[PDB]
Structure formats: C-alpha cells, structure tokens
Design a protein around this ligand. Structure first.
Ligand SMILES: O=C1C[C@H](C(=O)O)N([C@@H]2O[C@H](COP(=O)(O)O)[C@@H](O)[C@H]2O)C(=O)N1
Ligand SMILES: O=C1C[C@H](C(=O)O)N([C@@H]2O[C@H](COP(=O)(O)O)[C@@H](O)[C@H]2O)C(=O)N1
Lengths: 216, 220
C-alpha cells in the first residue's frame, strides 16, 4: 500500500537538497524510491537515515544486472543498509533474478522486477523481450514488477501477464511523457521524478498530481 | 596502442566486501597486476571513497564494474559520480539501447575517462536474452565509437564471434575464468586481458594464485 498511489523518485544528488524536496512533499508520500545518483554521491547510509528523518519506505532502484553470485552480494548490502525493496533487471536471465529472490526471502525483504524500460533506446532490445521477461517473472514467482507508463499499451499487457494479485509500479510519468491518469488504470502506483523535485515548488506539484487523480 | 595496456593481461575482480580484506588481498597481488576492477559489492559496503584509496595506495588503474543500465539522464549522473570518485573506466550494459550507452560515452569524453561496453555475459542465465542480442550490441557499440568491451570466457565460440565483430584494434576484456570455468589460455586467444575474482581473493594464498595464472600465460 502506497499513500496516494504516488512514489517519490528522489533523484537529486545533494544530500540536503534531497532531504529537502523530500520534506517539501512529505505530506503526499510515504514511499520513496532512491537510486544510484543519490546513494553513490552521499553513501548507503543516506538510506538508513531516510527511514527516520522521514519514517518512509525505501525502494532501492539499483537495477541489479550482474551474474547470480554478484547479484546476491549487491542485494545483501542493500538490505543490510536497510532498504525495503530493490529493483532488479530481468534481461540478465532467470538465474540472476533468482539470486536476488533468495536474498530477499532470506532477509524478509522485496524484489521488484523491471520488465520494460521507459526511454527510447528501450526499443532496440528490451521491448522485444518484455513479455518473456514478465513471464519469467511469473515462473520465478515474482510478485512485484515495474513497467513503463510511457507505453500505456505495454502497461496493460504487463498486467495481463503478471495477474491481478501482483504489485505493479510505473515510471516515465511527467518528464518522459506519461500521464498519471492513463497509467494508474493498470498499475498500483506511479513514480514521478523530475516533475516534482525540479519544480519552482515541489510541494505544489505533488499536490496537483494528486488532484489530477484524486478522483479514483 | 591507443588503449592502456594491462600488466600481465590480468585484471583482479576485487569483490571481497570488507575494506581490510580487500586491501590486504589486493596488496598481496600488487606486484602482479596493475588494473583493478571494483564493483558494487565493495563500493556499497565501504563507500565510493574506496575507489580513490585503492588508486592511490596501489597506483593501479580502476575499472568501476557498475553495469550502468538506466535511462540516459540517470546514466549520466552515475558516470559523473563514478569519475568524480576517480575511476578510470566504467562498465556499461548495452541491452538498454544506443541512447543509454551514448549518455555514458558523453560524460567519459567530457571528463577524459573510458567506457567498456558489456555485450554478452558469462553466466548461464545469459543465454535467455543477452546472447540473442550480443552480436548487435557489439556492432552497436562499434558504430557508437566504443573501443573497450567485455565478453564471456565461459563461451570461447562467442568470445571469438565478438572479437570478429569488434575487430583487432579494439580492447576486449573477459571475465569467467576460474570459478566460472574459463581457461586463462583459451580466453586470451581473443581477449586482450582476463578478469579474475574468486580464484585469487578466496585462495589460501592469493599471490601464489596470481603468480600461477600469470605463469601459465607467460608462454602464450
Ligand atoms: O524504465 C525505467 C527504469 C527506472 C525505474 O523506474 O526502475 N526509471 C527511473 O525513474 C526515474 C525517472 O523518473 P522521471 O524523473 O523521468 O519523472 C529515474 O530514477 C529513473 O532511473 C525510469 O524512468 N525508467
Ligand atoms: O558477464 C559477467 C559480467 C561481469 C563483468 O565482467 O562485467 N562479471 C564480473 O566478474 C567478477 C567475477 O569474477 P570471478 O569471481 O567469477 O573470477 C564479478 O565482479 C562479476 O560481477 C562476470 O563475471 N560476468
């Protein structure tokens, strides 16, 4: 359950700037997605902190895409650092995703499978494997997925593959071009990045987005 | 000669997760290699500063094995942060497409660092989707101006195919020799250097582990 179905993609690289725009919209969010831009430039402890300076839940968007052995070490350190869930790439195959799954289960945490990406280059290879990846995701027993809001049609097919009792979230809303309304029809929640943390007033953006979909 | 050469054609994949063991083990094999591959296992446990530290204390070049695989905008920040940390190079995935790779290349060009494109991976799972796109990712990397690549030693027939695609003038490094089954000798028929992790850092005696690989290759 994600408050207001919205997830903050705190992608600012300044620690303070981060805990700021994050505080300037704390009201409308309870789930934060944190990536490498912030973590590498400020350290993994920027996570265990968030889980207090804001009490929110943290999804580590690390797109794990290595061999099984290394994926296991990466997931361990991300969870030890105290992350609630970690986003994993599916293109490396089923043994690599399985490695992340074991660790999540061993530590009682969550794995999110990224099936398709939102950006343009995604057409070359990712798109043609998307469905097969989502399906691998089902054979593997994955219950959490990430899909592109930049492609409403794919987003609907994804929901068809994963089922109704699978959790789904969607990036690409706003800057990349996705609409917060169309997207929420198949996915359990959206993820908005730049469209918030870069507006003259981030507080008055994560307010309007909630308005454009406070109906549902 | 345009690309930096690797001492003894051997790159150490330092994936131990605690600062002291990483330092201790790397120090022991210093006289044998001058390039060190530092990935997320160490960097997420000890921090990115570990990158400048190794680079200073050992005088070795550092390849950040981060497998950048995000959208262009984010890949740019990951590369800028990695280079700001002092890495000499950064490994990038190709599957996300040409725009994602180009974003890494711009920053590398801007800051005077290098990009290695990972085309095909060495684990079994790699057969499911990356193998099928491997030749095209390689060819895509070539057309983008990529001069450094990573190909799998666990499949000489594939490493060979990739060498033909990228040609004789570009730099190819290959992981998977040792713990994964690749042979130092065969791999080097096509790769300029091999990446070795566990066979050295989980060995009773790392230096001997390294000296013994360097030895069986000395002739070839
Ligand atoms: O396919 C993907 C993978 C990844 C993800 O969601 O896992 N993201 C992340 O979503 C954020 C951009 O949202 P914004 O700033 O454009 O509004 C960044 O943190 C991206 O790395 C994508 O956008 N597309
Ligand atoms: O295809 C790949 C991708 C990646 C890479 O080389 O970029 N690696 C890395 O090579 C090291 C293992 O060498 P060892 O410990 O098995 O000796 C780890 O750091 C892996 O993440 C692979 O092994 N296979």
């Amino acid at each position: 359950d994600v408050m207001n179905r919205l997830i903050l993609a705190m992608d600012l690289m300044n620690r303070d700037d981060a805990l700021r725009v994050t505080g300037e919209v704390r009201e409308y969010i309870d789930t934060v997605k944190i990536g490498y831009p912030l973590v590498l430039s400020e350290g993994m402890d920027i996570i265990a902190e968030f889980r207090k300076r804001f009490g929110c839940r943290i999804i580590a968007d690390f797109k794990v895409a290595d061999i099984p052995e290394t994926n296991e070490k990466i997931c361990r350190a991300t969870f030890k650092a105290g992350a609630d869930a970690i986003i994993v790439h599916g293109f490396p195959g089923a043994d690599s995703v399985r490695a992340c799954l074991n660790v999540a289960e061993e530590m009682g945490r969550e794995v999110f499978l990224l099936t398709e990406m939102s950006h343009p280059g995604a057409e070359m290879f990712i798109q043609g494997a998307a469905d097969e990846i989502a399906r691998m995701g089902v054979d593997l027993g994955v219950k959490n997925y990430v899909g592109p809001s930049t492609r409403p049609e794919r987003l609907s097919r994804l929901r068809e593959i994963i089922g109704q009792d699978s959790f789904l979230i969607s990036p690409g809303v706003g800057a990349q071009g996705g609409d917060p309304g169309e997207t929420l029809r198949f996915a359990d929640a959206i993820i908005v990045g730049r469209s918030i943390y870069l507006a003259d007033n981030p507080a008055a953006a994560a307010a309007g987005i909630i308005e454009s979909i406070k109906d549902l």
